[PDB]
Write a protein that binds this ligand. Structure first.
Ligand SMILES: Nc1ccn([C@H]2C[C@H](O)[C@@H](COP(=O)(O)OP(=O)(O)OP(=O)(O)O)O2)c(=O)n1
Ligand SMILES: *CC[C@H](OP(*)(=O)O)[C@H](O)COP(=O)(O)O
Ligand SMILES: [Mg+2]
Ligand SMILES: [Mg+2]
Ligand SMILES: [Mg+2]
Ligand SMILES: [Mg+2]
Ligand SMILES: [Mg+2]
Length: 326
DNA sequence: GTCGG
DNA sequence: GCTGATGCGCC
DNA sequence: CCGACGGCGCATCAGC
């Protein structure tokens, strides 16, 4: 936690701009600045030193000088002591409650956990499950438990059809000692960029995981993306494991490398890499890397035979999953 | 809030 | 129905 | 100073 105080301050400012101000670009500006300062291998002495880093301008430099002087930020001190700002920030921690829904609830007098539980009728399905597991979803997953969850998913997927390949991505594939949730990239030979030779390919895997009581709830479900809740089985007399968030993304098998690049992240690494691609006249999504024409229209997919191939196109040296974190 | 053109 | 916009989610 | 800021899946709603 070398520049922990500064990165915490910038994260708190980011969350305010997203949750209260609904200023997504100011949120992205603060997260970018937080990320670059976290990687900086010196104790920052002044704002002028911070200002030399990319993504740190005049206003963040001024907030760092204030922070290093006083140990706090008057702007945050005031945000913390404002009821409406504080209420919106709390409600946004419930899965399914974003900035819009949070501000709506605060206007209806719903500002606390007790207010939410008294007014379940006013919540959509996602928001009901977010409230139900509010405590559990706050908790991080030790790598040891992620390895157990991996064993269940991969073995259960193999039982449905041995042609499925399931890859656990997110912070796990970046080699983190704990993860916020479980992200599963799924492929099957019968789903490519060219044809859907089999229907219900994702449905069948979700059903199997429900059948053995691993998946416990569904937040949303379509043909390619599942968003739900799972839980490790516990032994006799021992306390239940917390309920965990699970994302399952079915990716065309021929577009695996763009898919696994997307799903490995981190989110800030993806934004930086995709931003850099545009500067080099390319657009990257989870399916393809495409060149941009003179117009700014995306051309045809370029050939990708590895993660590294995508880095080569945008003239970046390969970063291993472990060097893509914040 | 930042920054390259 | 459908489409397009918006909210909230994922990395 | 200015335009751009990553890209998209699913749920929900307004308008036809
Ligand atoms: N969900 C997945 C995972 C992998 N693959 C394919 C892509 C590659 O052709 C091969 C394995 O690639 P990986 O990047 O997963 O390689 P590993 O690091 O697991 O193993 P190795 O280094 O031996 O290739 O399987 C796939 O179609 N679907
Ligand atoms: C950090 C100071 C702010 O920078 P931004 O362009 O969000 C403004 O300079 C003043 O703060 P605000 O008036 O409270 O937004
Ligand atoms: Mg700078
Ligand atoms: Mg939230
Ligand atoms: Mg995340
Ligand atoms: Mg995750
Ligand atoms: Mg996730």
């Amino acid at each position: 936690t070398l520049n922990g105080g500064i990165t915490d301050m910038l994260t708190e400012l980011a969350n305010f701009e997203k949750n209260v101000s609904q200023a997504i670009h100011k949120y992205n500006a603060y997260r970018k600045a937080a990320s670059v300062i976290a990687k900086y291998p010196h104790k920052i002495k002044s704002g002028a030193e911070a200002k030399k880093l990319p993504g740190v301008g005049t206003k963040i430099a001024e907030k760092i000088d204030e922070f290093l002087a006083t140990g706090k930020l008057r702007k945050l001190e005031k945000i913390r002591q404002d009821d409406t700002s504080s209420s919106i920030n709390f409600l946004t921690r419930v899965s399914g409650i974003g900035p819009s829904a949070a501000r709506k609830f605060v206007d209806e007098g719903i500002k606390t956990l007790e207010d939410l539980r008294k007014n379940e009728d006013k919540l959509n399905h996602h928001q009901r499950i977010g409230l139900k597991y509010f405590g559990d979803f706050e908790k991080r997953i030790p790598r040891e438990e992620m390895l157990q969850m991996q064993d269940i998913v991969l073995n259960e997927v193999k039982k449905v059809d041995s042609e499925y390949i399931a890859t656990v991505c997110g912070s796990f594939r970046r080699g983190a000692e704990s993860s916020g949730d479980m992200d599963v990239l799924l492929t099957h030979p019968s789903f490519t960029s060219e044809s859907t030779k089999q229907p219900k390919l994702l449905h069948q895997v979700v059903e199997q995981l429900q059948k053995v009581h691993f998946i416990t709830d569904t937040l949303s479900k379509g043909e390619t993306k599942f968003m739900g809740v799972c839980q490790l089985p516990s032994k006799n007399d021992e306390k239940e494991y917390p309920h965990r968030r699970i994302d399952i993304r079915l990716i065309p098998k021929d577009q695996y490398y763009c898919g696994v690049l997307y799903f490995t992240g981190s989110d800030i690494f993806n934004k930086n890499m995709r931003a850099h691609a545009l500067e080099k006249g390319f657009t990257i999504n989870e399916y393809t890397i495409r060149p941009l024409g003179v117009t700014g229209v995306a051309g045809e997919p370029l050939p990708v035979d590895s993660e590294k191939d995508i880095f080569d196109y945008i003239q970046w040296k390969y970063r291993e999953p472990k060097d893509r974190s914040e």
